[PDB]
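Technical annex B. To support the medicinal chemistry partners, we prepared a structural model of the target in complex with nickel (II) ion, based solely on the information shown next.
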Amino acid sequence: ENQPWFAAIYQKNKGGSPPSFKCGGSLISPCWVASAAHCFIQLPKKENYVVYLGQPGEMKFEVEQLILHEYYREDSLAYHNDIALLKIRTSTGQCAQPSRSIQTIALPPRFTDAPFGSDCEITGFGLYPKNLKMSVVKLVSHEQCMQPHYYGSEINYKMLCAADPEWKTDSCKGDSGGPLICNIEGRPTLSGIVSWGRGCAEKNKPGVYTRVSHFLDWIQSHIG
Ligand code: NI
């Protein structure tokens, strides 16, 4: 749901109507929100979007800068390098200010003993904020995909593989997207980037997430 790190990105609608909900993101820095690049590739300009933080919510930000990954590409199977950075700012010129309703979520450690983490949950639907479920999932390596029947019994959880062009993925390519959270070292962590749409909440066919840990450098190359 709405834990202090959740950011609701909206797309400024034309005319007098109200902006519509677009895709979700995570507050990784007081001045930075991470989200899916495929939510912006069709309108790549900063001024068409407004992010909301807090409990609309407790804080309104306009995006001073919109950074899509330079190697973003959509083949007919999945979104590769599907990651985007939003530098947020208020009308008063301030960035997001920490509280008990607005906190930053931890980024993946560069290295840890159990890289996949524990109790991983994806965000997604089952059109508007709060039809959003957080479904517990099972991250897997590319070897347990395409053939999980050769590794274990079937459970009612969805399996997800890290996005990779060399290994055929076949995952839903929704028009929306959001964060994948795992518990690394006992702390909630922005582990992945998933897409929201039809076929994105289904359990029997494995899906695909953009693995945040593979972009650390890139991220920090824009945050530091
Ligand atoms: Ni890895």
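Notes passed to the chemistry partners:
The helical segments are 216-223.
The longest strand covers residues 20-29.
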